Amino acid sequence: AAPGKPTIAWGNTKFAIVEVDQAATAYNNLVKVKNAADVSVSWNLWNGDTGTTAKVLLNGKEAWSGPSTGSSGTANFKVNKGGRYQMQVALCNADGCTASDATEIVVADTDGSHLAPLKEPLLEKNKPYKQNSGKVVGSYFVEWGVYGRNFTVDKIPAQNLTHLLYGFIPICGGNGINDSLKEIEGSFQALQRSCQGREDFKVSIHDPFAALQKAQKGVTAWDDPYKGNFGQLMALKQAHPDLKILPSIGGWTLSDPFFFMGDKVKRDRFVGSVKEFLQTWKFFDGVDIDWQFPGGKGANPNLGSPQDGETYVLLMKELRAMLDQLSVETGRKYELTSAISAGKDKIDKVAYNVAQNSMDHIFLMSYDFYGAFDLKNLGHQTALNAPAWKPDTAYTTVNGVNALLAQGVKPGKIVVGTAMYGRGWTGVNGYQNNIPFTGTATGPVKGTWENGIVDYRQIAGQFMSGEWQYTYDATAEAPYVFKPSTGDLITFDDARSVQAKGKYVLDKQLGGLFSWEIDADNGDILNSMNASLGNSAGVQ
Numbered sequence: 328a329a330p331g332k333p334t335i336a337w338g339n340t341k342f343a344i345v346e347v348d349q350a351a352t353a354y355n356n357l358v359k360v361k362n363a364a365d366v367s368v369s370w371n372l373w374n375g376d377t378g379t380t381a382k383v384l385l386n387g388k389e390a391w392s393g394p395s396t397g398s399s400g401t402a403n404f405k406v407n408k409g410g411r412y413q414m415q416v417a418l419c420n421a422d423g424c425t426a427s428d429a430t431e432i433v434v435a436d437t438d439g440s441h442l443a444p445l446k447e448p449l450l451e452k453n454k455p456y457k458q459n460s461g462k463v464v465g466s467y468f469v470e471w472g473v474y475g476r477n478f479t480v481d482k483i484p485a486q487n488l489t490h491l492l493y494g495f496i497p498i499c500g501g502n503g504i505n506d507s508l509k510e511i512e513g514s515f516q517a518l519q520r521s522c523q524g525r526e527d528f529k530v531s532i533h534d535p536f537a538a539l540q541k542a543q544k545g546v547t548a549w550d551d552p553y554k555g556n557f558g559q560l561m562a563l564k565q566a567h568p569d570l571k572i573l574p575s576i577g578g579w580t581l582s583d584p585f586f587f588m589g590d591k592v593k594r595d596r597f598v599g600s601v602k603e604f605l606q607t608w609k610f611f612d613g614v615d616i617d618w619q620f621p622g623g624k625g626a627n628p629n630l631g632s633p634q635d636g637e638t639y640v641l642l643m644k645e646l647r648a649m650l651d652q653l654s655v656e657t658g659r660k661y662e663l664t665s666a667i668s669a670g671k672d673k674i675d676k677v678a679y680n681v682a683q684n685s686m687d688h689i690f691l692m693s694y695d696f697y698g699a700f701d702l703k704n705l706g707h708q709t710a711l712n713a714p715a716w717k718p719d720t721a722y723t724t725v726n727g728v729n730a731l732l733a734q735g736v737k738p739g740k741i742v743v744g745t746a747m748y749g750r751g752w753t754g755v756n757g758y759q760n761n762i763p764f765t766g767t768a769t770g771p772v773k774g775t776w777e778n779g780i781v782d783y784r785q786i787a788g789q790f791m792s793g794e795w796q797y798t799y800d801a802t803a804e805a806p807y808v809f810k811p812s813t814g815d816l817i818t819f820d821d822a823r824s825v826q827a828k829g830k831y832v833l834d835k836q837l838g839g840l841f842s843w844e845i846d847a848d849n850g851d852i853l854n855s856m857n858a859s860l861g862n863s864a865g866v867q
């Protein structure tokens with residue numbers, strides 16, 4: 328007679344190809360990429376002949392086989408593809424094979440192949456758009472937004488984006504290499520613990536708790552291997568297979584290491600660490616380089632060199648070569664992008680007409696033109712055009728686009744920036760003709776999270792009522808709210824100025840729109856980005 332039917336033993340059924348060490352704070356120890364997951368299964372036979380061969384099947388296909396030598400057994404074998412499998416133990420002899428009932432086993436990998444899709448409802452004022460314009464619709468999500476800002480990946484209106492950038496992935500390095508980080512409390516030290524035992528100029532994760540271990544919707548079980556932002560992003564990729572999710576390296580406080588990359592030893596170490604990062608975290612679709620800024624004038628007053636433009640061009644070509652190689656290894660398309668200053672004084676330190684041949688998209692940061700970093704010279708922080716009272720204004724969106732176009736950059740590469748925040752001042756005074764921007768200020772406005780900066784959500788929620796004046800400057804294409812009794816002045820984008828940027832993109836055949844930062848919108852900004860670029864309302 329065939330053997331008795333085995334009963335799978337109770338036991339762990341959740342396994343991982345990329346293992347996460349739950350008692351590690353250094354990035355080198357935190358993750359272990361294997362070529363396959365170590366899986367184990369045990370069984371008992373409660374009734375009958377135990378057969379002479381035992382086999383473990385996954386969806387019918389043998390993963391392990393060995394002699395059946397008694398009423399219980401254990402099998403250890405490797406599974407090299409992530410996903411969920413119906414696993415069975417079968418005992419076989421010459422008269423037949425008798426298979427257990429199926430037990431599902433979960434083999435995790437960092438493409439999210441083990442996860443359910445995270446397809447959450449649109450919140451606040453977000454309305455559904457189809458991505459069918461062919462234009463970029465991008466936004467940044469910030470790793471530290473999950474604490475006080477309380478804005479997690481399940482709150483991103485992800486159907487309404489083509490590109491979701493993750494700010495920020497840091498480059499390892501202590502004194503002299505990430506000194507701008509010392510301005511943020513506990514931040515420099517944070518990085519040094521993440522990078523313990525790890526060479527400088529390799530990438531790491533700045534806050535491993537937020538990125539991988541904090542409990543979040545859909546990744547709450549103790550033994551879900553990837554939680555935090557990265558676990559949710561993997562499940563978001565399962566819901567939106569064509570969303571491009573890019574890791575952004577740098578930003579205002581993490582850009583110092585780029586200034587050392589004229590040393591090709593360091594540059595090559597960095598490039599190889601990026602390749603390793605994308606091999607490890609398979610949900611990411613490329614890399615975004617946010618070096619602020621080639622030539623200096625970023626957070627660190629002691630850095631910046633005439634060499635930086637060449638380094639930026641070489642970095643991009645070598646990034647693209649690495650990604651082209653990773654693309655043919657995997658069959659995947661990988662993207663290389665960069666977010667760049669929109670000021671013409673910074674643009675012309677780089678030959679973007681050469682660097683564009685390595686890049687998919689250039690995220691033109693057409694925001695922060697003005698703000699509480701200068702109390703004397705006030706202006707619209709993200710306007711399309713100069714205002715009527717100063718038609719020679721240097722920092723406008725059009726001037727940064729035109730500086731790029733004058734280099735020879737193809738218009739289709741250029742993605743125009745929209746701000747989901749305002750900048751502002753307090754004590755504005757001494758202005759003519761009811762235009763507060765002709766005055767000077769005494770300090771920054773009271774921010775939502777930091778001085779001088781206000782989420783758009785709060786502008787709409789609190790500063791479009793009461794004593795606040797609202798004006799849409801149709802020359803500049805820029806809204807502003809002003810409280811005459813305190814002299815609080817806030818410059819921001821709103822649905823109409825975004826619509827102007829969107830029509831301008833379509834008119835000039837530019838690449839699309841992106842925004843900083845997704846948590847600060849109530850829906851009005853991203854709704855307008857989508858509509859102004861010609862995406863149809865609704866779902867596919």
Ligand SMILES: CC(=O)N[C@@H]1[C@@H](O)[C@H](O[C@@H]2O[C@H](CO)[C@@H](O[C@@H]3O[C@H](CO)[C@@H](O[C@@H]4O[C@H](CO)[C@@H](O[C@@H]5O[C@H](CO)[C@@H](O[C@@H]6O[C@H](CO)[C@@H](O[C@@H]7O[C@H](CO)[C@@H](O[C@@H]8O[C@H](CO)[C@@H](O)[C@H](O)[C@H]8NC(C)=O)[C@H](O)[C@H]7NC(C)=O)[C@H](O)[C@H]6NC(C)=O)[C@H](O)[C@H]5NC(C)=O)[C@H](O)[C@H]4NC(C)=O)[C@H](O)[C@H]3NC(C)=O)[C@H](O)[C@H]2NC(C)=O)[C@@H](CO)O[C@H]1O
Pocket residue numbers: 467471472473474475476495511512513514517534536541577578579580581617618619624625666667668669670671673692694695696697700722748776777780843844
């Ligand atoms: C034409 C021309 O040339 N114009 C010129 C201008 O361009 C120029 O101005 C510059 O222009 C640039 C563009 O050209 C622009 O950069 C780009 O544009 C973006 C927009 O400006 C810019 O945005 C910047 O980005 C920086 C980073 O680079 C941001 O900095 C962040 O700031 C945050 C504070 O607001 C920081 O935060 C804190 O984060 C820490 C972690 O480090 C966190 O710590 C945790 O806290 C919680 C507590 O709640 C803890 O959690 C608890 O415990 C558990 C877990 O342990 C929890 O689970 C739990 O919930 C909780 N419980 C408890 C106890 O409550 C946890 O344990 C903590 N642990 C610690 C200590 O670690 C804090 O919570 C965070 N606090 C808050 C409030 O959030 C954040 O760290 C910091 N990030 C980094 C990486 O540094 C800025 O905010 C952001 N600004 C804006 C507008 O948003 C981008 O960088 C650039 N973009 C791109 C695409 O590259 C420049 O900004 C601009 N610079 C200036 C100066 O303005 C000017 C000047 O040169 O010149 C003109 O001429």
